[PDB]
Amino acid sequence: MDKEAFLERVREGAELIKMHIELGHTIRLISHRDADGITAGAILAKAVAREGGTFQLSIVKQVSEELIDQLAREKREIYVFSDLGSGSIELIEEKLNFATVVVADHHPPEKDSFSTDSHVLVNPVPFGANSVRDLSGSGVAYFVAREMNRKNRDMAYVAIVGAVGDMQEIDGTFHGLNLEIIEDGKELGILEVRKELRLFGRESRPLYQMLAYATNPEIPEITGDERKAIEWLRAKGFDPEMKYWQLREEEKRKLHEALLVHMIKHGAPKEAIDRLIGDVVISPLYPEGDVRHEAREFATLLNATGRLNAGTLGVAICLGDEEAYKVARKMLDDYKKEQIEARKFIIQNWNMVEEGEHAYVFYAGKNIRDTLVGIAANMAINAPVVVLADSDEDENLVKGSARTTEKALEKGYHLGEALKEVAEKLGGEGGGHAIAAGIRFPKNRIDEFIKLFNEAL
């Protein structure tokens, strides 16, 4: 992989940052809004603060031409992109040529380097590193931070949280430069690697939900059916309401054996079976039973904050702010309350649903927020469906989401193209995938949307 060549880029990027800190310049930080991006943002933020420097961090959805424009209007001395920017090398050099640019990313880059001298691409991929297992976005940021100051090795666990969120260990174990981060954390005693059940819900979920939400790997006759997980665990002699971390090492070992026997019976893929038990990263810095105690649980928390436009709140959590974790918990719980109320409104008010030839159309008005409009259509099915809701951000706009099943997709019914087609006719943004998509269009053209959508199927 030529680690020494990548390390050279790391030092070059780290020195640029340190140089501008010495000059008292504001280190403008930009990072992605998932676990990998949030952790990366926190790592670079702490590195700057540790040097007594000044930063301004923004957690964004993605790099856009509009974003680079308003970034250029700021006319900073130095811009630092984290978990972003590799596919926008040309765009960055075009508009941010006047300043120093450091791109710390692991995504396949547009070029292997920058043309200008003041711009540095810290990316392991041009050196032969696998983008999806050798290092994550937070991993790159960690390398840069550690090179600025070896004290930044205390962010090793944070970096791994991002790595797990980036599914760098989908194999069941860690690979590449991630192992170097693992070792740093072990030497400081801030993280441990244990061979356990690689499922989400180790800290905060009951056993029957940890098995029902089982993805990578999926568990046959258990994943999806929440009630079956209760039945299965009862027969094996486990308390379904108990949590995995509350189990003794003997009970976990018995649970592993029981699950493995089950999957072999129902003909689970050999690859899936090998991914049931593997590396699980925990941290002694947090109490057991806390979501921050385990990497996958921590990454799940951060993703939730990122989706609720509170990415920097999640950043603050990585920085050790207990108050921020408090605010985030209350925020997520409030969001949970909105869901069950939104799903309650669909059932009670299904008598106002527009009957269509090829699709369902439900208008909730301002009762359901535009963010809950996506999960609203699914539970309407779990009890094509399109739910419409008034835009909180806008006023004359309505946000809609289309959800369907595999049975309808078998008979054509491609939602994404049909939704993007109608969106172009009503003069609004839309489109998505095949089973799930979103759309924004004028509120005074709902009756027109229903007509045009069914005809596009």
Binding site: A49, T54, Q56, S58, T312, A316, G320, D321, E322
Partner: protein
């Protein structure tokens, strides 16, 4: 000049600090190190919130 870290919660135009440095402009949700004399007032009118960076 004493500084601190905050999460700016509203769109905020650039302002000059007592250290003759310019801070901002801020978009809603930005985290930044700014002079505490400015950050305190922002927190006072609920425009920002303190974030503690354990160093």
């Amino acid at each position: 000049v004493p500084k601190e870290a905050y999460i700016i919660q509203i769109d905020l135009p650039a302002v000059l600090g007592p250290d003759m440095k310019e801070y901002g402009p801020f978009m809603a949700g930005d985290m930044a190190i700014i002079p505490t004399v400015i950050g305190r007032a922002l927190v006072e009118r609920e425009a920002a919130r303190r974030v503690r960076i354990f160093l």
